[PDB]
Amino acid sequence: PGDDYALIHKNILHSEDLLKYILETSVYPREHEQLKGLREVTEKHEWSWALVAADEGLFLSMLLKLMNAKRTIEIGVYTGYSLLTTALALPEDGKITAIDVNKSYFEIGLPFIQKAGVEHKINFIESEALPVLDQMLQEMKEEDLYDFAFVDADKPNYANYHERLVKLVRVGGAIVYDNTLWFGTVAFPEYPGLHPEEEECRVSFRNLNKLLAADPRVEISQVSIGDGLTICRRLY
Amino acid sequence: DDYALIHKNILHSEDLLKYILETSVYPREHEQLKGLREVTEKHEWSWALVAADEGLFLSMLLKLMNAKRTIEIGVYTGYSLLTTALALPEDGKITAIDVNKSYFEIGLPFIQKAGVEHKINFIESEALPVLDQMLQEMKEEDLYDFAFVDADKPNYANYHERLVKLVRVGGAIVYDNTLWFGTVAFPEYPGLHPEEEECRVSFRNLNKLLAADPRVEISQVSIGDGLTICRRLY
Ligand SMILES: Nc1ncnc2c1ncn2[C@@H]1O[C@H](CSCC[C@H](N)C(=O)O)[C@@H](O)[C@H]1O
Ligand SMILES: Nc1ncnc2c1ncn2[C@@H]1O[C@H](CSCC[C@H](N)C(=O)O)[C@@H](O)[C@H]1O
Ligand SMILES: O=Cc1ccc(O)c(O)c1
Ligand SMILES: [Mg+2]
Ligand SMILES: [Mg+2]
């Protein structure tokens, strides 16, 4: 027991005009027609602010092709914007493992994924990600390690996902954690006016960011795009 | 000191940027990069220095694409160049171009102490004639994997025409300062230095050009002063 959240309308850029400039100039003209349709129906959804930023989407797509990723895993699908972004970026024989507790969210965006003709690349698993990742390491052979991992699910579990993913991602592969700036609230020891769960995610991200910055197993780079993201490259 | 944008940033608070640098940048910054950054921040043109969080991002992009052969346009004291040389493998080679060697020799002691001076071939010249003669001598086997453009902003579109033939297919061209301190979001911006206003107009034109260029895919990233990654399609 015991719209409720304060971090929906706050962004990390100085100006609403600047963010709208990037979207109107650099994103929307380059957005796939099915990504546009998926984003538009998601914007009407009850959890629409969890939708990944559209400029962050194009950045993830650029990362995937520049590193020639072929096998990826996504944790946190929602309506599937970043998933469809990933699928459109990979080669036609690319494969994605998509994990989410709620497949009903996934089926909101699946028609757009189907019309985009990339559903065949996606293996959706309806479950909590942690048992799926633990079952993977039992069956994970080094020849089939993932090239790329996008983490965008339950925020407080990121550090737990990290311990599994640096063994499920190949050496030199990338793990991308979304929301590592958490609307800017991570820059302060305390932040008043937060919903209890928004406060836990703030504390969890402040701990995760120090963890990733000290983890010798990876090289990192925190990027102030969207709600922030941290790119991790496995060293060993 | 007569420029109106030196104290502007694109993030909403100085505290957020400071948090990123102290949490996720400085503990990962090479000792010679910190030394080069600290002596550059007292130079008279210190606001041209690339942001440290952006440098760590360029290094991540180089390693993820396994770049071997890159070119840098706009060296200054060599923070991005040293960042690039430290990211490339031992046999990596960089072509670094800058009209001013006086700036490069400030960072050269740090580059040598890092042990990566052998990767760098510095050319003191205007970049445009260097690129044009490269088009005359280049063989397809010698194409660059990665290009970082950070020099005179009004010439970015001219550099683009050369670079989409000098970087390999699937290679990356990254343009710095494409958000230009937030000024590009506005058709008119008051009180800018004449050179600052020239770059706002030039960047507003460059951003629409790149976004409509079928030769490349793009991603404009709101890091530092904004950068645009370009991936060559053909
Ligand atoms: N423990 C868990 N395991 C797997 N998924 C979870 C989870 N807890 C929450 N999630 C899911 O993570 C998602 C976060 S929203 C993710 C946004 C999406 N990647 C996009 O591109 O827009 C939600 O759909 C939620 O259902
Ligand atoms: N036409 C031109 N051709 C080549 N270099 C030029 C140029 N016009 C200006 N430059 C150089 O481009 C540099 C831009 S400052 C670049 C910053 C640097 N990349 C860093 O990491 O900090 C200046 O040093 C300037 O000397
Ligand atoms: O659940 C709230 C939420 C808000 C923003 C996000 O980016 C996200 O992944 C989740
Ligand atoms: Mg997210
Ligand atoms: Mg610059």
Side-chain angles (χ1 to χ4, degrees), chain A residues 178-229:
Chain A
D178 192 26
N179 295 97
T180 51
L181 289 180
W182 202 238
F183 304 84
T185 67
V186 298
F188 308 101
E190 272 268 66
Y191 197 96
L194 291 192
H195 178 282
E197 272 146 15
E198 292 180 314
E199 166 67 22
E200 183 198 6
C201 297
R202 179 191 74 87
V203 175
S204 173
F205 271 121
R206 281 174 57 86
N207 298 324
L208 176 78
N209 295 354
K210 312 194 221 203
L211 193 157
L212 294 179
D215 194 348
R217 299 169 296 185
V218 295
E219 274 160 352
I220 70 162
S221 166
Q222 193 167 31
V223 187
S224 65
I225 187 178
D227 197 39
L229 51 80

Side-chain angles (χ1 to χ4, degrees), chain B residues 47-51 54 148-150 153 156 176-177 225:
Chain B
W47 80 311
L49 172 68
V50 75
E54 177 174 342
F148 181 56
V149 188
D150 201 6
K153 320 302 173 192
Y156 272 32
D176 197 25
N177 307 95
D225 195 41

Side-chain angles (χ1 to χ4, degrees), chain A residues 72 155 182:
Chain A
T72 78
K155 299 325 180 218
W182 202 238

